[PDB]
Write an enzyme that holds these catalytic residues in place. Sequence first.
Site, PDB file in Angstrom:
ATOM      1  N   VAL A 116      -9.473   7.201   3.802  1.00  0.00           N
ATOM      2  CA  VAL A 116      -8.333   7.248   4.161  1.00  0.00           C
ATOM      3  C   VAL A 116      -7.506   5.912   3.927  1.00  0.00           C
ATOM      4  O   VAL A 116      -8.041   4.946   3.624  1.00  0.00           O
ATOM      5  CB  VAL A 116      -8.223   7.472   5.911  1.00  0.00           C
ATOM      6  N   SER A 117      -6.291   6.132   4.150  1.00  0.00           N
ATOM      7  CA  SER A 117      -5.449   4.741   4.048  1.00  0.00           C
ATOM      8  C   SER A 117      -4.255   5.052   4.751  1.00  0.00           C
ATOM      9  O   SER A 117      -3.330   6.048   4.288  1.00  0.00           O
ATOM     10  CB  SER A 117      -5.089   4.587   2.579  1.00  0.00           C
ATOM     11  N   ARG A 118      -3.778   4.463   5.731  1.00  0.00           N
ATOM     12  CA  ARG A 118      -2.488   4.548   6.556  1.00  0.00           C
ATOM     13  C   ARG A 118      -1.316   4.476   5.776  1.00  0.00           C
ATOM     14  O   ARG A 118      -0.444   5.144   6.065  1.00  0.00           O
ATOM     15  CB  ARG A 118      -2.599   3.684   7.900  1.00  0.00           C
ATOM     16  N   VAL A 119      -1.414   3.511   4.956  1.00  0.00           N
ATOM     17  CA  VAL A 119      -0.010   3.098   4.251  1.00  0.00           C
ATOM     18  C   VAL A 119       0.259   4.236   3.500  1.00  0.00           C
ATOM     19  O   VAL A 119       1.396   4.832   3.236  1.00  0.00           O
ATOM     20  CB  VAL A 119      -0.195   1.788   3.426  1.00  0.00           C
ATOM     21  N   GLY A 120      -0.754   4.855   2.451  1.00  0.00           N
ATOM     22  CA  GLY A 120      -0.805   6.156   1.735  1.00  0.00           C
ATOM     23  C   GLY A 120       0.502   6.065   0.869  1.00  0.00           C
ATOM     24  O   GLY A 120       0.489   5.227  -0.143  1.00  0.00           O
TER      25      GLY A 120
END
Lengths: 128, 55, 47
Positions: A116-120
């Site tokens: 996952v990566s919140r910034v996305g």
Amino acid sequence: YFRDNGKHALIIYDDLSKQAVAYRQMSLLLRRPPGREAYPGDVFYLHSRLLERAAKMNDAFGGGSLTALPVIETQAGDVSAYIPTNVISITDGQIFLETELFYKGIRPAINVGLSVSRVGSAAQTRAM
Amino acid sequence: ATLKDITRRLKSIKNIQKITKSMKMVAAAKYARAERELKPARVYGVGSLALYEKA
Amino acid sequence: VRSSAGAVRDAGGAFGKREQAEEERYFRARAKEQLAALKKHHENEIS
């Protein structure tokens, strides 16, 4: 220093699961009471105060930044352990490497299903 | 593994065993019916083959 | 220690993924069939 002087820096702690062990040894030899799995009580703090320094200063404070890539080591994929869960709830993203993928030929073993990566969207070039 | 891994695996295998037992019972009933219906069809088909093995 | 409903897909072992795929393939097929029928009905109901 770099992020405070308008420059950009990248830091890679490798591993943090060994800083936790060294801290536990220190705390046990100072006679401080142990906690869960013998780690001191302040074992989350230990990391949270450390990974919270990886900021992205605004343009008034130089604009510099400091990325962090802590490396944790799980035991037989038990992500549910103590330090892994602490650091997972501290960090933004994750990159899950799995041995079943490493041996199945997928290298890097990044488990794109769970990673996952919140910034996305943000922090990605328009073509990518 | 850890305790939760073992618990989940044990529950899954228990469900699988229940399902396979039920399916064995169903298959046994259908087998009994199939044998019952196979006897007359056995005589009928053997008769229908009679000619070629006789001539 | 007991067992509960919907546990095969809670473990997530091999049977869990096998069941998930056995479901997804079937329902993709049925969705394709239903979409074809929906297109046919759309065309046949324009007039």
